Each structure stands twice: as structure tokens, then as C-alpha cells.
Amino acid sequence: MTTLMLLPDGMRRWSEKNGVSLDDGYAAMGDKIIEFMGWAKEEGVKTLYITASSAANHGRPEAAVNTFMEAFTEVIRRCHSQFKFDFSGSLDLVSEDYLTELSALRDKSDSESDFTLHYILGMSLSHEVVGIFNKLNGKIPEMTEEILAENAYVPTQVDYIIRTGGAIRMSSFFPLMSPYAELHFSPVLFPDTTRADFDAALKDLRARDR
Amino acid sequence: MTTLMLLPDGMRRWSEKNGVSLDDGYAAMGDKIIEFMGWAKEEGVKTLYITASSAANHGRPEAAVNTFMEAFTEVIRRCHSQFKFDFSGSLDLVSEDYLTELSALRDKSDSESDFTLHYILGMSLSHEVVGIFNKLNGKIPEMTEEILAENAYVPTQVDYIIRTGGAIRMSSFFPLMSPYAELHFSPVLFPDTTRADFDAALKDLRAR
């Protein structure tokens, strides 16, 4: 079954366009994620990676960081019984409070579910590689691809990547060990995404086996 | 000014469509690369990175490997005085014959040119990172972003990436230290690229 990575982009522009607070933008994002997970389950996806943040996002003022961390965490608070939950990334950039709570939510999630919802926090290839080197430096005889795969943020290969929000770039979010990922860029702001947008993405992605 | 990375794709399909040998497709690519460098030079790009091959490509049958290595090398024999030439990548996968000649051709090129043509060979993120780790393991106190950048295949940050040939994916070619590279995907087979295709690509890229 399919491994899909979702890059939810456009919450701020959506908030401004609809004349609402950024908090309401992130709440609309959380509701969309829950909706999007349901679509993914119907569509043969077994693992949904969501890029919760780039490493740079965690350098914003703490209140702004707490704002998006709280929105992503609330999704798991509401739906952790509907899937197996895990997270990974630049954990050195995340506060103790959120790491502690997300670890609790992982333990409480349905370990028997066929569907995985996995958050990647603080994505950045340079940060990822730097961290991996400094953890293993002088501790092993040689690096191999198997060892690199074991230490990478994204622990499996990604088949498809969907980026909302109109940017045609990968920013900090390219998955290190996933050379073959097919990319689909949508101009739609993430909180406006419909199932029709998702279905169009999957038809595009599926037709690449011409 | 700007740093552009080109992914030339579609030589096989172009060869079949035009009923010629794969060597002839690669010859057409070489001519197109020279033409494309002229467009790039006129449009103010100062560094043009070209992905000559993925790591996987060097696993192809060995005559096929010599075919693309020869076609890319021929470009640099022909134009190395018109730019500064350099190359990098998974050189452990490249034949020492081409590595010797390319190393000579690098030393040969116009060191004073304000335009750089740089080949990346055997590109692969995992292979790149494994190699960097194994090169520095136990020899430095700690890795930093600056040390990683000094060891990465692509030695500078990439502003724009153009991938021809219709694939909407980065395959083995994502540049490690260039998170903010803007991507442009063209459906045109590389040897079919026209100046209009290049101008449309840059217009899209410049507006972004």
C-alpha cells in the first residue's frame, strides 16, 4: 500500500483571506488533517507522514511555536484511537512539554491499526545529517545505507508527496532516503483542500505509470 | 548572480522518436548543452550545475556507461576555455580513465572565467551522506553546517532547478544544501529544448 507525505502550507494566507485569527487558521488546519486522514484510508494509503514543521519554524518566538505545536498535538488528542501514531525529526528543537505529551499520545494510540499517522518535526536535511553524524561520530566503524536508513527522520520510503499552498519547491522537507518520490504541487491553500483536490492529486500521481 | 542546476532527461526517448542510435541521442544532448550554456550565459546565470548521472546510472551495462560518460566529456573537451570547469560526486563509481581526463580538464579550463560549468556524477543523497560520514568519521570533533557544505557534492546553494523530460520528481538529484531551490519541470525531451523553452522556464522561475 501507499506511503504519502503531506506538506500542509498556506494557513496564514488562509487566515488573512478569511479575515480570521491565525489560531483559527491552525484550527481549520487540524480539522482538515482529520478529514484528510479519512480520505487517505479510503484511498489505499497505509502511512501518512505529515511535515509538522521545518527546523527554521522552531526558531520563531516561543508563543508562535506553541501555537502551531498545540494545533498539531490537538489533532492527535482527538483521534489517537483511530490510528497508530508516531513522530520523529529534530527532537532537540522541540520542548520537553510537547515531546512528553506526544510520547504519551503515541503510547495511547492504536498500536494494532493498519494506518499510521506520523509527524515529522523540525525537518531540515542539513540539520538531520549534522545530527546523525554527531551522534555516531567515532562510535561505529563505517556508515552503510542500512545504518543511515535506521537513523533518518523518515524511517520508510515515500511514494508520493503532496504539497499544498502553491510553492513549487521542497523547502526543508525532502525525505532523505526517498529518491523515487513522485511530487504533486497544488496551488490550493491547505485549509481549502477538498476531496476533489486530493482525488486530482492521486489521479495525477497514479497516471505516472503510463 | 544566479546559480542554475540542469537535469537533462529524455535522451533514450529522443533517440527512439528520431530513429537514431543512443550515441546519436547523447551527441544531440552534448550539442544542446553547449547551446544551453550560451543561453544561460546571456541570461546572467554564473554557475551552471549539470547532473551528468545518478549513482544508479553507473550500474547500467558498461558500454552504455561509456556512451554517456563520453558524450558529457566531449562537451568539456570542446568548450573548457569558455568557462571554469569542475566536477564532483560519487567518484568511487566513475572509471579512473574518465576521472583522470576530467581532472586534467578541470586544471585546463579558464580559471579566470566568471562562468562556471560544474558536472555532478553519480548523484545520490544516501551515497553522498554515507561517503561524507565515512570520510570524516572519528577525524573531526563535530560536524557543522559549514563543514557539511564544504563536503557536499553541490558546493554552493542552487537558486533554480530545471528538469526536462517530463518527470515531476527529483529522483537522485536533490541538492543537499539547497532547501530553497525553486523547481521548474518541463515536459520537453532535453535534445528538443529550444530557447523558447529556456525563456519560459526562467520567466516562471523569476516570478515565483
Ligand SMILES: CC(C)=CCSP(=O)(O)OP(=O)(O)O
Ligand atoms: C510545514 C510546511 C509544509 C510549510 C511550513 S514551512 P514554509 O511555509 O515556511 O515553506 P517555505 O519557506 O515558504 O518554502
Ligand SMILES: CC(C)=CCSP(=O)(O)OP(=O)(O)O
Ligand atoms: C504548519 C506551519 C508551521 C506552517 C504551515 S502554513 P505558513 O505559515 O507557511 O502559511 P503561509 O504559507 O505563509 O500562508
Ligand SMILES: CC(C)=CCSP(=O)(O)OP(=O)(O)O
Ligand atoms: C541524468 C538525469 C537527470 C536523469 C538520469 S537518471 P533516470 O532517467 O533513470 O531518471 P529517474 O531516476 O528514473 O527518474
Ligand SMILES: CC(C)=CCSP(=O)(O)OP(=O)(O)O
Ligand atoms: C544523462 C543520463 C545518463 C540519463 C538521462 S537521459 P535517459 O537515459 O533517462 O532517457 P529516457 O528518459 O529514458 O528517455
